[PDB]
Write a protein that binds this ligand. Structure first.
Ligand SMILES: COc1cc(Cn2cnc(N)c3ncnc2-3)on1
Length: 167
């Protein structure tokens, strides 16, 4: 048993809810919250800016030190950093950004990072402002992630369609 409430069960291991990932993280304090990161860990908007704002910019301060030491992530890659006041850990995962021209095939690689964690609270990778179709992102998630993932979908209308079209 765990603390996640009101999720629809899609598969053995994937659950979904219409919710802001920030409000869910603040209420649940999960072991792992996933950030929809970019390779520079510049958290300006979308899930990254919302999460970073909720940490009072501590996520960005920590991220800038990570980049100064290690250099940028890969598209499809990830790093584990603090979850600050939201979670124990934040898994920063870089899905491909269609609005920058990146290979959508890298979305599977991105979701493979989730398999290193038994339970995660996550957004739909590469969806929202990253330009991919969230229906596609959900399908790749279900077909790639084997650990237990609780997906928070901010947008009510896209959430309604993601459920109603799920195969
Ligand atoms: C346009 O539709 C969208 C966009 C997104 C991405 N996203 C953005 N900011 C949030 N605070 C989220 N929490 C869950 N997902 C979040 O979700 N649905």
């Amino acid at each position: 048993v765990n603390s996640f409430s009101g999720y629809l069960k899609l598969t053995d291991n994937v659950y979904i809810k219409n919710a802001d990932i920030v409000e869910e993280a603040k209420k649940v304090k999960p072991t792992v919250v996933v950030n929809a990161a970019n390779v520079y860990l510049k958290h300006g908007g979308g899930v990254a800016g919302a999460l970073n704002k909720a940490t009072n910019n501590a996520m960005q301060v920590e991220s800038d030190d990570y980049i100064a030491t290690n250099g940028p992530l890969k598209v499809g890659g990830s790093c584990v950093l603090s979850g600050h006041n939201l979670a124990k850990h934040c898994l920063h995962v870089v899905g491909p950004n269609v609005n920058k021209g990146e290979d959508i095939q890298l979305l599977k690689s991105a979701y493979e990072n989730f398999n290193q964690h038994e339970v995660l609270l996550a957004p739909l990778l590469s969806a929202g402002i990253f330009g991919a179709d969230p229906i596609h992102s959900l399908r790749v998630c279900v077909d790639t992630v084997r650990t237990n993932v609780y997906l928070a979908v901010f947008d009510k209308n896209l959430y309604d369609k993601l459920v109603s079209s799920f195969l």
